[PDB]
Amino acid sequence: KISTSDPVRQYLHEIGQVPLLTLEEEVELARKVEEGMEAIKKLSEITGLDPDLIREVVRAKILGSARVRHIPGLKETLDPKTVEEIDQKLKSLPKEHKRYLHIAREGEAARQHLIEANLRLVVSIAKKYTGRGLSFLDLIQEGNQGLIRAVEKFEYKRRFKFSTYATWWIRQAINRAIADQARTIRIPVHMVETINKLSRTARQLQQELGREPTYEEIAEAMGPGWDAKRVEETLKIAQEPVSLETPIGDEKDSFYGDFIPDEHLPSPVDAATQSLLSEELEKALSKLSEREAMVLKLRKGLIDGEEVGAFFGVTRERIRQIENKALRKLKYHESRTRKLRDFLD
Amino acid sequence: KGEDVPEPSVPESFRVLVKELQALALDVQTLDEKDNPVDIFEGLASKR
Amino acid sequence: ADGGKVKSDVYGRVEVDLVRNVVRVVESYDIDARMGAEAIQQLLKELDLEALEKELLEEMKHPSRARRAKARKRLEVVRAFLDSGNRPEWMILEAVPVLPPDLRPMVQVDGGRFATSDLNDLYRRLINRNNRLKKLLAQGAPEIIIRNEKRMLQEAVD
Amino acid sequence: KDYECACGKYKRQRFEGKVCERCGVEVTKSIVRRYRMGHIELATPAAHIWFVKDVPSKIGTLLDLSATELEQVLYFSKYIVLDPKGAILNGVPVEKRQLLTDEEYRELRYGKQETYPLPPGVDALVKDGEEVVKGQELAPGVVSRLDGVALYRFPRRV
Amino acid sequence: ETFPIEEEDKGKGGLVLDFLEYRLGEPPFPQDECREKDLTYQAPLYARLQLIHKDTGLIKEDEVFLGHIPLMTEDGSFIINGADRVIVSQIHRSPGVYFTPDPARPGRYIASIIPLPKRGPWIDLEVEPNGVVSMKVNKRKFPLVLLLRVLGYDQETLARELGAYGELVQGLMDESVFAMRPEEALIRLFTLLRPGDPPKRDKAVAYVYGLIADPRRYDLGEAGRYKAEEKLGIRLSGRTLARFEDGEFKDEVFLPTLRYLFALTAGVPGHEVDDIDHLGNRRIRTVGELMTDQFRVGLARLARGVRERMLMGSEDSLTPAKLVNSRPLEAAIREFFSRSQ
Numbered sequence A: 001k002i003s004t005s006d007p008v009r010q011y012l013h014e015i016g017q018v019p020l021l022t023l024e025e026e027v028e029l030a031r032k033v034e035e036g037m038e039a040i041k042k043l044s045e046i047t048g049l050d051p052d053l054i055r056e057v058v059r060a061k062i063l064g065s066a067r068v069r070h071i072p073g074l075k076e077t078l079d080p081k082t083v084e085e086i087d088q089k090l091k092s093l094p095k096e097h098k099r100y101l102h103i104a105r106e107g108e109a110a111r112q113h114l115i116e117a118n119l120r121l122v123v124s125i126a127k128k129y130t131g132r133g134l135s136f137l138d139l140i141q142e143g144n145q146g147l148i149r150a151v152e153k154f155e156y157k158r159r160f161k162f163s164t165y166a167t168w169w170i171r172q173a174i175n176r177a178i179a180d181q182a183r184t185i186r187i188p189v190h191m192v193e194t195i196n197k198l199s200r201t202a203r204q205l206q207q208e209l210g211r212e213p214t215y216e217e218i219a220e221a222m223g224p225g226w227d228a229k230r231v232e233e234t235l236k237i238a239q240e241p242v243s244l245e246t247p248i249g250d251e252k253d254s255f256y257g258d259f260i261p262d263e264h265l266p267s268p269v270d271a272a273t274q275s276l277l278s279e280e281l282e283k284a285l286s287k288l289s290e291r292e293a294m295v296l297k298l299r300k301g302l303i304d305g306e307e308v309g310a311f312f313g314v315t316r317e318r319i320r321q322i323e324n325k326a327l328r329k330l331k332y333h334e335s336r337t338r339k340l341r342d343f344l345d
Numbered sequence B: 001k002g003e004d005v006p007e008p009s010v011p012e013s014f015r016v017l018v019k020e021l022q023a024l025a026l027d028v029q030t031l032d033e034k035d036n037p038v039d040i041f042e043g044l045a046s047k048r
Numbered sequence C: 001a002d003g004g005k006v007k008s009d010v011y012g013r014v015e016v017d018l019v020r021n022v023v024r025v026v027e028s029y030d031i032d033a034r035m036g037a038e039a040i041q042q043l044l045k046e047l048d049l050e051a052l053e054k055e056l057l058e059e060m061k062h063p064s065r066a067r068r069a070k071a072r073k074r075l076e077v078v079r080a081f082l083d084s085g086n087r088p089e090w091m092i093l094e095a096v097p098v099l100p101p102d103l104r105p106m107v108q109v110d111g112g113r114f115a116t117s118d119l120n121d122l123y124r125r126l127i128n129r130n131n132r133l134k135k136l137l138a139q140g141a142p143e144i145i146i147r148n149e150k151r152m153l154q155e156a157v158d
Numbered sequence D: 001k002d003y004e005c006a007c008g009k010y011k012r013q014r015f016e017g018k019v020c021e022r023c024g025v026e027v028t029k030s031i032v033r034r035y036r037m038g039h040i041e042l043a044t045p046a047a048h049i050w051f052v053k054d055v056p057s058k059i060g061t062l063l064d065l066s067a068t069e070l071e072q073v074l075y076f077s078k079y080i081v082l083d084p085k086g087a088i089l090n091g092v093p094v095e096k097r098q099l100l101t102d103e104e105y106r107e108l109r110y111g112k113q114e115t116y117p118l119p120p121g122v123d124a125l126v127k128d129g130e131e132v133v134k135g136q137e138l139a140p141g142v143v144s145r146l147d148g149v150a151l152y153r154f155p156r157r158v
Numbered sequence E: 001e002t003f004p005i006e007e008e009d010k011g012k013g014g015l016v017l018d019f020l021e022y023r024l025g026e027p028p029f030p031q032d033e034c035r036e037k038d039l040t041y042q043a044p045l046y047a048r049l050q051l052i053h054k055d056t057g058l059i060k061e062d063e064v065f066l067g068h069i070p071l072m073t074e075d076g077s078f079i080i081n082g083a084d085r086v087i088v089s090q091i092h093r094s095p096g097v098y099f100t101p102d103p104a105r106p107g108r109y110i111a112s113i114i115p116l117p118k119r120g121p122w123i124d125l126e127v128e129p130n131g132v133v134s135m136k137v138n139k140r141k142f143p144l145v146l147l148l149r150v151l152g153y154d155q156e157t158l159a160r161e162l163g164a165y166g167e168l169v170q171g172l173m174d175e176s177v178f179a180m181r182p183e184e185a186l187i188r189l190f191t192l193l194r195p196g197d198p199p200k201r202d203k204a205v206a207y208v209y210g211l212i213a214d215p216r217r218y219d220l221g222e223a224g225r226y227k228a229e230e231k232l233g234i235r236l237s238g239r240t241l242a243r244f245e246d247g248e249f250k251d252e253v254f255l256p257t258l259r260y261l262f263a264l265t266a267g268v269p270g271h272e273v274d275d276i277d278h279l280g281n282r283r284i285r286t287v288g289e290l291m292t293d294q295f296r297v298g299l300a301r302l303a304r305g306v307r308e309r310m311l312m313g314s315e316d317s318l319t320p321a322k323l324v325n326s327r328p329l330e331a332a333i334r335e336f337f338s339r340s341q
């Protein structure tokens, strides 16, 4: 039906069925996640397999079948045969190393478990970064990504609990997202804080003048290197775009884009130009000596805009010689039979 | 050039449409005498 | 297998407690459980329209008017599919065509105001979510959050 | 741009049908920019609404599913439809094409029953439970004896 | 209308911001200078304001010029932006109560109570006798008597004095089970509305359809009470059906409307049929009203933000900038003169 309620109910229901106890459950899971790490590494040590591979195979066996490996990541790990071979060596690990295998999986499991339980935490956080320009679900989602980030770095040895830790790692993920996706035209985090500062400043300035500050105040109040050109620019970038498709004029049936003209396209007038221009330019180019005429025709009209570097083997003196003598004979007879005079431009 | 005007090429309303249509799953392909392709988008749709 | 997924006999899950040699063996089996276009993509590929055509033919003229009427309307779609044109596994979307660029312009208005076809805000919607999805799978995947997104994703595709 | 490349290695009409060595651009004017198509590769599929929400669900019709409600049910949220086989029971055999809820679904893949009841104090229920918990198969309705009555109403081990 | 902002409790309050005198006087620039230069000829306005405290102290920050409101030329036209503009009058149903014939069933006609502004109920009384009567505020219908009971009209005094001459009285005394408990009927109707609300709310929602907001502050005397005494019912105690002195409400309007429906349906008390298009029903909005309404809309937008700042300001010096922000009133009134259709 309507999307917010369903997810809210979705995880709130599962937290309702499994909140994590303050100390015990979070400690429990934490301890297991870490042991997983120490496990996987020792596994790489004895298998010679990259901890990335050992990590992905324990993931498959605990989080999903061939289905989850084939669609998400296209196909480098053979759906069946590949992952299985990897599990066989894990089995071969005697009593000593087999232990790490069994731990890795159980660890991985705990991980996901700690992640489920602290989803209300995200939503509670994400709840306040609402009207920034991101959908609540998008916001919760990035924040979620943030909590997963936290899980990777939490050191349970250092007594502080995951609550306070997740907060930071989530708030960071969100704010980033808000700064990277919120607009149509990307704007770096610096420009963002800059705009917030700009905004906040305009607020304190609205406070007493009764005059929406000229870009003079803003420069001042802002600080060290602020000037009118700077603020006029920033607020020009702050205005989000408009809709090429918006209800226009009297709101009846008016769509905004019919009004904007076009520039690259040669309005007939231009197509006719290029026709005479090229035919006449082409007639002259042939009646001349190819030597320095083509040099300048090609050097200028074929690739890019170098007198010396323009002529093949013959030096500058023959260039200027024929360039300026052919260019003038060409111009002066074109003066006689006036075809070019009428500036095609 | 005083040329008897040329014989019409495909209208952009048509091409705008086909693509609008392609934007949605649907595939609209024009056909030949015998049910075979023909080409509206002159040479810009074949790839690379 | 260690203590997640292991199918021995009719009982199909196996937990392990190296304390006492205890091989915990939970009893439920491979239940193909799916939700979302994934589940329907499957369903759609598996059907041999010829079979359902013939099946409906019989259902059409033989039983009374209630279930045979439903079968006539259901035979319409199946027939055309088979008749001429293309086959039905395509109704599912896994590859989203993107409309050209100049048709969804980005233009310079006034002051430096810019103007873009509303289509581009929707496209970014899809792309960001599609991407966020990929990174969410990779990072590790808590179910609720994956669906949550797949939901948004779907909606976006609409 | 008109006939020119992005970088400019090749810039006029003579080689009109070839692409640039270091960067890719075959040219005729910016019209190619407005006629060409790009595509987004979806993570996990989704479906066309043009086919799913037209009055006759072209997919609900072809796939005998609840023409209008079974779709909406599994499509946008998590209501599962057993696709190929699922040996274990609900009370009856595996539902070839029928749909089930998260709850009952949950009850299926981990084990029949999940009962985590953890005691209030340190000596009253911690003793009742422990004594009968480790190797003793606890039958349904095992009446643990101390806070209120710790009731274990389900199956096999503890 | 919107100045006495009473904000009492959720944390600390007892806020009382009061209006003294409204004064506007020195135009920024003049007419022709307003046309040569792009300028909106508007007079400056700042009224006197003094906010009270529950602690000893009342800070009076005299002026705050919010809202530059356009002026009228001696001919009657304005000067908004470069071009002289004009505000055209309008027409509509003058907020009253009428009885129009029923939609499809040729049978009998139904009653309508019209309360403008928009926010503010829209009542209708219809009887479909196989077992139901219909009175609708937002949409779903309920009993015409459960309400009179609430107010204090009991089955006996009601039925005999009002409809002795009106047999329809029988539909009124019908569900006696609920008519036998007074104030409990108040809680019962509350229950009839639907959220899943606290049964206990002493006299809160009854107030809303009682004295202040929804019914209207259109001048006490001739605004609505004209449509009353001549068309139906004789008196009004308090502008619209209004009272908050004892917790027990008075409704000299709820009974007369039914009184006239029993009357309209039963003969000639007079001939009670209202031709809507009678101009005594369709009213003309002169310029003033059109501006006063946008001015008040802005006043609410202003008073909305100010409430937030009765909590934001640290201690007592919160009179000037802490309570007033000229952003709303400007955009609001400005929008009416330049963008109003």
Ligand SMILES: [Zn+2]
Residues within 6 Å of the ligand: D005, D006, D007, D008, D009, D010, D020, D022, D023, D024, D025
């Ligand atoms: Zn290039």
